[PDB]
Amino acid sequence: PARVAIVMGSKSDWATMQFAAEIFEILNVPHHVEVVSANRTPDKLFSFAESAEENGYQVIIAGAGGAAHLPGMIAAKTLVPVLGVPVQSAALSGVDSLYSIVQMPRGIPVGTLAIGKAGAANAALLAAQILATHDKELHQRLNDWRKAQTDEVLENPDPRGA
Amino acid sequence: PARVAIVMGSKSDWATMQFAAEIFEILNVPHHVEVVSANRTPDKLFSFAESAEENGYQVIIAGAGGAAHLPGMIAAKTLVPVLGVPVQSAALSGVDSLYSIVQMPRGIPVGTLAIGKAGAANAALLAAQILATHDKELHQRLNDWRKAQTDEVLENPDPRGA
Amino acid sequence: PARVAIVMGSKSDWATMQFAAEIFEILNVPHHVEVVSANRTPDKLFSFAESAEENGYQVIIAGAGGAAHLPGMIAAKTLVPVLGVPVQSAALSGVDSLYSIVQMPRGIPVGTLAIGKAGAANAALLAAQILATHDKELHQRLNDWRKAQTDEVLENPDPRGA
Amino acid sequence: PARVAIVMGSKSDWATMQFAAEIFEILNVPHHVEVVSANRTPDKLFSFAESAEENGYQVIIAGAGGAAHLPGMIAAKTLVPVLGVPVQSAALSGVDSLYSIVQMPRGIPVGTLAIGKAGAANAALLAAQILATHDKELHQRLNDWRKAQTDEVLENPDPRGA
Amino acid sequence: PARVAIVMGSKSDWATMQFAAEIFEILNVPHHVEVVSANRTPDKLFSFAESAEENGYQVIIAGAGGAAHLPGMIAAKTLVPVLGVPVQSAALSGVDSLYSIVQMPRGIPVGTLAIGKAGAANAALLAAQILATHDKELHQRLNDWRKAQTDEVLENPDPRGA
Amino acid sequence: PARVAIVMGSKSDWATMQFAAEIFEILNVPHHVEVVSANRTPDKLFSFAESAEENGYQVIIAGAGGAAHLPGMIAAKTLVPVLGVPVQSAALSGVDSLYSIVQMPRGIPVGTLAIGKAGAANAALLAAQILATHDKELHQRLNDWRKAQTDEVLENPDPRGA
Amino acid sequence: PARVAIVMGSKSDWATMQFAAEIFEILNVPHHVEVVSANRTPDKLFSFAESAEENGYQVIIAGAGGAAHLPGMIAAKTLVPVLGVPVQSAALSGVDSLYSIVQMPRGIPVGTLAIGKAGAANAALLAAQILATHDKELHQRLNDWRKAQTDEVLENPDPRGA
Amino acid sequence: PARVAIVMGSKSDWATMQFAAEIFEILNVPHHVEVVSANRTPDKLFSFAESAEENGYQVIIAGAGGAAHLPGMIAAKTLVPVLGVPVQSAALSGVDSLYSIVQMPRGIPVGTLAIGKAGAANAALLAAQILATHDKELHQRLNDWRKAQTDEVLENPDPRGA
Ligand SMILES: Nc1c(C(=O)O)ncn1[C@@H]1O[C@H](COP(=O)(O)O)[C@@H](O)[C@H]1O
Ligand SMILES: Nc1c(C(=O)O)ncn1[C@@H]1O[C@H](COP(=O)(O)O)[C@@H](O)[C@H]1O
Ligand SMILES: Nc1c(C(=O)O)ncn1[C@@H]1O[C@H](COP(=O)(O)O)[C@@H](O)[C@H]1O
Ligand SMILES: Nc1c(C(=O)O)ncn1[C@@H]1O[C@H](COP(=O)(O)O)[C@@H](O)[C@H]1O
Ligand SMILES: Nc1c(C(=O)O)ncn1[C@@H]1O[C@H](COP(=O)(O)O)[C@@H](O)[C@H]1O
Ligand SMILES: Nc1c(C(=O)O)ncn1[C@@H]1O[C@H](COP(=O)(O)O)[C@@H](O)[C@H]1O
Ligand SMILES: Nc1c(C(=O)O)ncn1[C@@H]1O[C@H](COP(=O)(O)O)[C@@H](O)[C@H]1O
Ligand SMILES: Nc1c(C(=O)O)ncn1[C@@H]1O[C@H](COP(=O)(O)O)[C@@H](O)[C@H]1O
């Protein structure tokens, strides 16, 4: 079953969020992907959040740009851990996204990742690490992936041209 | 009837939002005041927004600090104009409040006012000006108020001590 | 008659403000468009603001970039509600526009929208929502528009390639 | 056993991190608390991170101010999910803390919370929600806590003085 | 005659602008001081700017906080050089004041000074240096003042306690 | 004689400062242009500043990007009014230029203009307005120029395509 | 002999720079302390920089607030390594100090430390580490100091009250 | 022997750090270049830092973008002076890099240079100046280089086209 869901405020966010999905593909982690907007589909957001647990989601990755309300609104309607990804906005280069996601008041948390593509990928990795706590196989695949990343740098110490 | 409602994410916002109410008192404008949180009372926010029109509200002033979702979520659930007040937050002095309120994407607007007390008062004044468009009496009181503000400065040109 | 006017500090602002006008076209809302600069045509700004009410304007959308004085100066000379649009400036990407428009002192409000194109469109939508309070037809068209925006997202939940 | 550990760069961070511990006390969640500095006790950080899994930690909350390296360094040495809390710094009011924690590159994530006390508490709540995924009892206590927070606001709608 | 005028948006600005006046007192430079608000006394601002030249002003120092429109509006209505002083605002510590004053578009300049008291004093010094270009006496007094400032530092090289 | 000098930290600044010179060409104002760096030609800066008055300069326009020391260092070595132009830097888009120029301490002023090309032009206009105080002809040309700028906007009120 | 000099733009900087001197006292490192201002004592700055090498200085720590020109100007006049300390300014909390010091163009470096007291101390530590490269004794004292700092944290792992 | 080492968090940093190496080539200064990541090769970072002194390094230049931990972690594990270069990050244009490097707490310093290429070059120049303190030859080459930079500007005073 899909233990993790990736949601975003707009299809225009996909160019960023696609990197979260990429991680799940590499790690062979079943995942759900959907466009859910707190501003354009508020009712759907509520139904989505309310049914998150019953649908089997253990982690929810939500991405949005500008005045991002999606991550926080979902977190306010469910106990499923919510990780937020600040999409890089045009004018404020994601600073508004970042602040509107991370500065949650006491009581309703949202684990925030870096602005942009790096954050999208990291949100998937973090969600995967959360799942790995109770999934020996995934935990193993995660370990292998990290090893591969490290070794790639280790076997290529000199950045200068050959 | 109360044609305007003043809502805020927390009772701790009252120290700021009280200045919006003060304007309505001076202008003799019936108003509703209530604590509505998108993060702590999400369901109530929805019911409040959905019934806004039927309850007779023509303008809604919403204030919040930090990652402010209140103004935007209300605006996403009603056609009643929503004015947002960025409450000055401790760490980011309202910058996060400001960005999380004003940077709304295309489709759902929130007329934003200055950070803090000045903004709270101005949101009431703006809402009043909106109501005055169809309320000759209020329009008159608004005019008198502005005159009084101007004349006070005009009759006190020298700021130095007498 | 035109119940709303769209003004901007420079013709170079049109690339942004055009999106406000686009909304009015979609909603069939009569509107006036004009270049009015507080810095280059200060006298005209005053005459424009002073005659706003008599000319039938119920809302004024003003856009400017950099040290934006246009919105505030108009608001200081009329009771007609003024909505400001921060045009994205080159160096400071609209942050200066934003601050110079929203940070109005107590007494003279300016409902501010997002930086750039999204804000321009939203200012028109907000102005339209204000007009809809007393225009059943427009209120209906607004409702249909919102429905269309929501349904478009609802019928396209998966952002991935078919 | 303690399934969660709370670490911080300095004892001066305790004034902030104490709010994370407070949450665990309310929720009856066994937790470990310790001062671990990437800058002053780098070797200890490594030993702490390396033994995190074997010691039974499923989540690690790390707080630091200024150029915060603690959260990221721990996350680079273990698969245990790491949540970071930006402590409010004097000069930059936590902005440096925030950026130095959240802007992690692809490969090593750190779920970041709000700057300051609110973030500390939220990091505990998020960690608790993560644990609740497999702890029915804790999940229940979390649910009761949220209910209590919501109801407190619901039974106190008017912020004005009685 | 008074060749320089010091204006400010509010009497609350006097705590800052008083330092500009202090410089003129030290240099024995006749000056006019007055509260002129672009937002509260727009008409007066226009009359003041329009009559600036005929009244004998060769330099105008204008101070304001927040969305400062005063300096720019005066500069748009007269050829008399305008120097602007960003008053330190509460929420944004003068950053909004600074941006709203200095970021003037091509065509209408405003020589901006530092945020706060230091800027107020410097605006007077700069205005004095401008006047000194054609006032040998003032030029001399300016020179003596600078010498005194320099010598004070020179005769006190060690900041440690005696 | 040349009553105004335009200096800059690097030849790479010319792309910006050229707009200051353009103003002087339009106004037929004799001017000197030279590359003077506080960091690369510190001694020359001193000689240039020290001889400014004797060389007949009444105003000095200095432009620089990044940690701009040029404007301030010149102002510290002469009584000739110094106007500073913040060149738009790559990384910080002129914010560092702006702060390093405008935030001068009490005692040594630098009238700062907008970041970039607009500021360069404005610095020339401001310097020209300063000179016009005692140059009836230039004052007249300035007046004509402003009229032309205003009239261009006035005769082109509609920004839409014909 | 004194191999390191501590200079600052104003005696008001001493409250910050005193922490640099404190480090040298602890490490028994002979040092010179003096107020040198690029803005108020420009000539002295030049003489100081020019004679730095002949006077035996191997490192120069310079602190200043606001538009800090001191560090950069010294570095432009000598080959002696210059370390800069951004003093926390009132309005911009050291951000202007930071930018005006660190953003030096290619050719003239200034090793910058943290804003405020922490930076002052660190500049002394860094300078000491530089000297230690050729001073076995100092290198030893530095090592002991670091050990003491580390051990203090190590023997006090629990920040909670006994 | 190589008395200076240039390290960076990723090979993608080479486009920036290459300018540090360029300086060493011009000055004929033996140097080591290597990719060392605190996040991807934490163990290697430790071994690298621990063996820095024994390997003969007297200065270490470390560059990284985003949440830069590399410079600080190295400095926490060795007495060899560490100079940090903030690589310009996409979203925050190096501001996050800058803050995460310079805002080190008391006890472990990192001399920080400008964001980007200019900083990379300057870090090499600063490191060279440090080495020159005990290398007469290098000190001479440094002097010649500075002379050449100065003279190039001096013989090209007019930036206008011939
Ligand atoms: N922040 C939100 C929300 C929300 O918070 O519900 N919905 C959309 N958005 C953001 O609007 C930006 C522009 O979206 P469009 O391209 O569809 O106009 C995107 O970054 C989206 O995440
Ligand atoms: N931004 C929001 C929301 C919301 O967006 O729904 N709810 C509360 N808050 C803000 O949290 C801050 C601290 O509130 P508390 O003092 O109750 O912890 C307030 O500024 C409130 O507006
Ligand atoms: N902010 C203002 C005002 C005003 O405030 O009156 N007038 C023009 N502007 C802005 O100058 C920028 C550049 O305009 P130009 O392209 O005509 O130089 C535009 O964003 C305009 O809105
Ligand atoms: N950021 C770090 C690290 C680290 O990253 O390892 N170690 C200490 N610190 C921070 O230094 C600040 C001042 O600490 P001190 O009061 O002990 O000088 C604290 O916020 C701490 O978290
Ligand atoms: N910026 C302006 C203008 C203007 O631009 O005309 N008028 C007042 N203000 C500023 O409002 C702030 C608060 O003023 P109040 O204390 O009177 O509310 C002051 O800094 C004033 O300069
Ligand atoms: N800020 C200064 C100073 C100075 O302050 O003396 N000298 C050069 N610069 C700036 O360095 C930037 C890059 O210059 P280069 O292209 O020559 O490397 C320019 O903006 C220049 O004004
Ligand atoms: N930045 C400089 C320079 C300089 O750059 O030469 N000289 C003084 N200053 C700074 O002015 C601030 C206020 O100084 P005062 O208290 O003497 O007015 C201090 O932070 C000083 O370092
Ligand atoms: N900041 C760090 C660290 C570290 O601090 O150890 N490791 C990599 N990075 C930075 O990640 C950015 C993107 O790197 P990638 O292109 O490899 O994803 C680079 O600027 C690197 O310095």
PDB file of N, CA, C and O and ligand atoms in Angstrom, chain A residues 118, chain D residues 73 103-106, chain H residues 8-13 36-40 45 63-71 87-89 97, ligand 8:
ATOM      1  N   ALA A 118      15.914  20.549  -4.082  1.00  0.00           N
ATOM      2  CA  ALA A 118      16.681  19.856  -3.054  1.00  0.00           C
ATOM      3  C   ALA A 118      15.771  19.485  -1.885  1.00  0.00           C
ATOM      4  O   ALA A 118      15.880  18.391  -1.314  1.00  0.00           O
TER       5      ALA A 118
ATOM      6  N   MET D  73      24.841  17.865  10.963  1.00  0.00           N
ATOM      7  CA  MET D  73      25.921  16.912  11.170  1.00  0.00           C
ATOM      8  C   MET D  73      25.400  15.594  11.722  1.00  0.00           C
ATOM      9  O   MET D  73      25.887  14.529  11.355  1.00  0.00           O
ATOM     10  N   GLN D 103      18.264  24.794   4.873  1.00  0.00           N
ATOM     11  CA  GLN D 103      18.850  24.733   3.536  1.00  0.00           C
ATOM     12  C   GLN D 103      19.847  23.605   3.278  1.00  0.00           C
ATOM     13  O   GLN D 103      20.915  23.830   2.701  1.00  0.00           O
ATOM     14  N   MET D 104      19.487  22.392   3.697  1.00  0.00           N
ATOM     15  CA  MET D 104      20.336  21.216   3.497  1.00  0.00           C
ATOM     16  C   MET D 104      20.295  20.794   2.029  1.00  0.00           C
ATOM     17  O   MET D 104      19.248  20.869   1.383  1.00  0.00           O
ATOM     18  N   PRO D 105      21.435  20.336   1.486  1.00  0.00           N
ATOM     19  CA  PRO D 105      21.488  19.908   0.088  1.00  0.00           C
ATOM     20  C   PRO D 105      20.846  18.532  -0.074  1.00  0.00           C
ATOM     21  O   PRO D 105      20.601  17.837   0.909  1.00  0.00           O
ATOM     22  N   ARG D 106      20.585  18.143  -1.316  1.00  0.00           N
ATOM     23  CA  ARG D 106      19.968  16.853  -1.607  1.00  0.00           C
ATOM     24  C   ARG D 106      20.764  15.675  -1.045  1.00  0.00           C
ATOM     25  O   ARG D 106      21.969  15.565  -1.273  1.00  0.00           O
TER      26      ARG D 106
ATOM     27  N   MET H   8      35.936  21.861  -0.907  1.00  0.00           N
ATOM     28  CA  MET H   8      34.580  22.317  -1.204  1.00  0.00           C
ATOM     29  C   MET H   8      33.591  21.177  -1.021  1.00  0.00           C
ATOM     30  O   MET H   8      33.946  20.007  -1.170  1.00  0.00           O
ATOM     31  N   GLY H   9      32.349  21.526  -0.703  1.00  0.00           N
ATOM     32  CA  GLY H   9      31.328  20.521  -0.478  1.00  0.00           C
ATOM     33  C   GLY H   9      30.913  19.688  -1.675  1.00  0.00           C
ATOM     34  O   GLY H   9      30.499  18.542  -1.506  1.00  0.00           O
ATOM     35  N   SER H  10      31.021  20.249  -2.876  1.00  0.00           N
ATOM     36  CA  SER H  10      30.626  19.532  -4.086  1.00  0.00           C
ATOM     37  C   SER H  10      31.449  19.940  -5.300  1.00  0.00           C
ATOM     38  O   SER H  10      32.010  21.036  -5.343  1.00  0.00           O
ATOM     39  N   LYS H  11      31.513  19.058  -6.290  1.00  0.00           N
ATOM     40  CA  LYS H  11      32.250  19.368  -7.503  1.00  0.00           C
ATOM     41  C   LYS H  11      31.562  20.541  -8.203  1.00  0.00           C
ATOM     42  O   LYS H  11      32.187  21.262  -8.978  1.00  0.00           O
ATOM     43  N   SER H  12      30.275  20.735  -7.921  1.00  0.00           N
ATOM     44  CA  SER H  12      29.540  21.839  -8.530  1.00  0.00           C
ATOM     45  C   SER H  12      30.027  23.175  -7.963  1.00  0.00           C
ATOM     46  O   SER H  12      29.689  24.234  -8.485  1.00  0.00           O
ATOM     47  N   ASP H  13      30.830  23.117  -6.902  1.00  0.00           N
ATOM     48  CA  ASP H  13      31.376  24.327  -6.291  1.00  0.00           C
ATOM     49  C   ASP H  13      32.626  24.782  -7.036  1.00  0.00           C
ATOM     50  O   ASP H  13      33.043  25.938  -6.915  1.00  0.00           O
ATOM     51  N   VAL H  36      35.446  17.786  -0.285  1.00  0.00           N
ATOM     52  CA  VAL H  36      35.209  17.223   1.037  1.00  0.00           C
ATOM     53  C   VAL H  36      33.858  17.736   1.494  1.00  0.00           C
ATOM     54  O   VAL H  36      33.646  18.945   1.573  1.00  0.00           O
ATOM     55  N   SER H  37      32.941  16.820   1.780  1.00  0.00           N
ATOM     56  CA  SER H  37      31.605  17.213   2.210  1.00  0.00           C
ATOM     57  C   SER H  37      31.303  16.783   3.628  1.00  0.00           C
ATOM     58  O   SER H  37      31.482  15.624   3.986  1.00  0.00           O
ATOM     59  N   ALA H  38      30.835  17.732   4.428  1.00  0.00           N
ATOM     60  CA  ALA H  38      30.496  17.456   5.811  1.00  0.00           C
ATOM     61  C   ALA H  38      29.225  16.627   5.831  1.00  0.00           C
ATOM     62  O   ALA H  38      29.015  15.822   6.731  1.00  0.00           O
ATOM     63  N   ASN H  39      28.389  16.818   4.817  1.00  0.00           N
ATOM     64  CA  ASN H  39      27.126  16.101   4.741  1.00  0.00           C
ATOM     65  C   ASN H  39      27.196  14.746   4.046  1.00  0.00           C
ATOM     66  O   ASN H  39      26.499  13.815   4.440  1.00  0.00           O
ATOM     67  N   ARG H  40      28.039  14.629   3.026  1.00  0.00           N
ATOM     68  CA  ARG H  40      28.152  13.379   2.277  1.00  0.00           C
ATOM     69  C   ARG H  40      29.370  12.518   2.613  1.00  0.00           C
ATOM     70  O   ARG H  40      29.358  11.304   2.394  1.00  0.00           O
ATOM     71  N   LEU H  45      35.823  14.081   6.282  1.00  0.00           N
ATOM     72  CA  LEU H  45      36.051  15.444   6.739  1.00  0.00           C
ATOM     73  C   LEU H  45      36.854  15.383   8.030  1.00  0.00           C
ATOM     74  O   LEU H  45      37.846  16.090   8.193  1.00  0.00           O
ATOM     75  N   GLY H  63      34.925  25.995   0.740  1.00  0.00           N
ATOM     76  CA  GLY H  63      33.764  26.624   0.131  1.00  0.00           C
ATOM     77  C   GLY H  63      32.543  25.720   0.101  1.00  0.00           C
ATOM     78  O   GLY H  63      32.664  24.509  -0.094  1.00  0.00           O
ATOM     79  N   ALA H  64      31.361  26.302   0.291  1.00  0.00           N
ATOM     80  CA  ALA H  64      30.118  25.532   0.269  1.00  0.00           C
ATOM     81  C   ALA H  64      28.912  26.449   0.089  1.00  0.00           C
ATOM     82  O   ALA H  64      28.972  27.632   0.421  1.00  0.00           O
ATOM     83  N   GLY H  65      27.824  25.897  -0.441  1.00  0.00           N
ATOM     84  CA  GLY H  65      26.622  26.682  -0.656  1.00  0.00           C
ATOM     85  C   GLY H  65      25.467  26.162   0.169  1.00  0.00           C
ATOM     86  O   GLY H  65      25.487  25.004   0.609  1.00  0.00           O
ATOM     87  N   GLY H  66      24.457  27.007   0.375  1.00  0.00           N
ATOM     88  CA  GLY H  66      23.302  26.619   1.168  1.00  0.00           C
ATOM     89  C   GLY H  66      23.666  26.559   2.641  1.00  0.00           C
ATOM     90  O   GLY H  66      24.371  27.430   3.150  1.00  0.00           O
ATOM     91  N   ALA H  67      23.168  25.543   3.339  1.00  0.00           N
ATOM     92  CA  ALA H  67      23.489  25.368   4.752  1.00  0.00           C
ATOM     93  C   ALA H  67      24.916  24.808   4.769  1.00  0.00           C
ATOM     94  O   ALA H  67      25.122  23.591   4.808  1.00  0.00           O
ATOM     95  N   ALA H  68      25.894  25.706   4.717  1.00  0.00           N
ATOM     96  CA  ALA H  68      27.301  25.319   4.688  1.00  0.00           C
ATOM     97  C   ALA H  68      27.827  24.903   6.057  1.00  0.00           C
ATOM     98  O   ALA H  68      27.919  25.712   6.980  1.00  0.00           O
ATOM     99  N   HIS H  69      28.179  23.635   6.175  1.00  0.00           N
ATOM    100  CA  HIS H  69      28.689  23.103   7.426  1.00  0.00           C
ATOM    101  C   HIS H  69      30.169  22.761   7.310  1.00  0.00           C
ATOM    102  O   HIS H  69      30.878  22.665   8.313  1.00  0.00           O
ATOM    103  N   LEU H  70      30.628  22.585   6.077  1.00  0.00           N
ATOM    104  CA  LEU H  70      32.014  22.231   5.827  1.00  0.00           C
ATOM    105  C   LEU H  70      33.061  23.102   6.534  1.00  0.00           C
ATOM    106  O   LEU H  70      33.856  22.592   7.323  1.00  0.00           O
ATOM    107  N   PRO H  71      33.066  24.422   6.281  1.00  0.00           N
ATOM    108  CA  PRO H  71      34.056  25.295   6.927  1.00  0.00           C
ATOM    109  C   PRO H  71      34.088  25.171   8.445  1.00  0.00           C
ATOM    110  O   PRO H  71      35.149  24.975   9.049  1.00  0.00           O
ATOM    111  N   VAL H  87      29.419  29.985  -1.373  1.00  0.00           N
ATOM    112  CA  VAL H  87      29.103  29.765  -2.784  1.00  0.00           C
ATOM    113  C   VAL H  87      27.708  30.324  -3.025  1.00  0.00           C
ATOM    114  O   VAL H  87      26.824  30.169  -2.186  1.00  0.00           O
ATOM    115  N   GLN H  88      27.504  30.986  -4.158  1.00  0.00           N
ATOM    116  CA  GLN H  88      26.195  31.553  -4.427  1.00  0.00           C
ATOM    117  C   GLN H  88      25.174  30.455  -4.700  1.00  0.00           C
ATOM    118  O   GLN H  88      25.281  29.727  -5.682  1.00  0.00           O
ATOM    119  N   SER H  89      24.189  30.343  -3.815  1.00  0.00           N
ATOM    120  CA  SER H  89      23.133  29.345  -3.944  1.00  0.00           C
ATOM    121  C   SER H  89      22.034  29.888  -4.858  1.00  0.00           C
ATOM    122  O   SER H  89      21.869  31.100  -4.985  1.00  0.00           O
ATOM    123  N   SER H  97      24.374  30.690   2.509  1.00  0.00           N
ATOM    124  CA  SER H  97      25.763  30.247   2.570  1.00  0.00           C
ATOM    125  C   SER H  97      26.519  31.176   3.519  1.00  0.00           C
ATOM    126  O   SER H  97      27.203  30.732   4.437  1.00  0.00           O
TER     127      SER H  97
HETATM  128  N1  LIG I   8      26.918  22.845   2.112  1.00  0.00           N
HETATM  129  C1  LIG I   8      27.283  21.692   1.554  1.00  0.00           C
HETATM  130  C2  LIG I   8      27.885  20.622   2.195  1.00  0.00           C
HETATM  131  C3  LIG I   8      28.423  20.622   3.627  1.00  0.00           C
HETATM  132  O1  LIG I   8      28.175  21.618   4.342  1.00  0.00           O
HETATM  133  O2  LIG I   8      29.091  19.633   4.001  1.00  0.00           O
HETATM  134  N2  LIG I   8      28.002  19.635   1.313  1.00  0.00           N
HETATM  135  C4  LIG I   8      27.503  20.078   0.159  1.00  0.00           C
HETATM  136  N3  LIG I   8      27.074  21.333   0.292  1.00  0.00           N
HETATM  137  C5  LIG I   8      26.585  22.212  -0.793  1.00  0.00           C
HETATM  138  O3  LIG I   8      25.470  21.674  -1.516  1.00  0.00           O
HETATM  139  C6  LIG I   8      25.387  22.525  -2.672  1.00  0.00           C
HETATM  140  C7  LIG I   8      24.793  21.742  -3.845  1.00  0.00           C
HETATM  141  O4  LIG I   8      25.595  20.593  -4.124  1.00  0.00           O
HETATM  142  P1  LIG I   8      25.117  19.513  -5.220  1.00  0.00           P
HETATM  143  O5  LIG I   8      25.240  20.247  -6.647  1.00  0.00           O
HETATM  144  O6  LIG I   8      26.246  18.365  -5.215  1.00  0.00           O
HETATM  145  O7  LIG I   8      23.760  18.990  -4.953  1.00  0.00           O
HETATM  146  C8  LIG I   8      26.822  22.959  -2.986  1.00  0.00           C
HETATM  147  O8  LIG I   8      26.950  24.375  -2.833  1.00  0.00           O
HETATM  148  C9  LIG I   8      27.634  22.251  -1.901  1.00  0.00           C
HETATM  149  O9  LIG I   8      28.719  23.081  -1.477  1.00  0.00           O
END
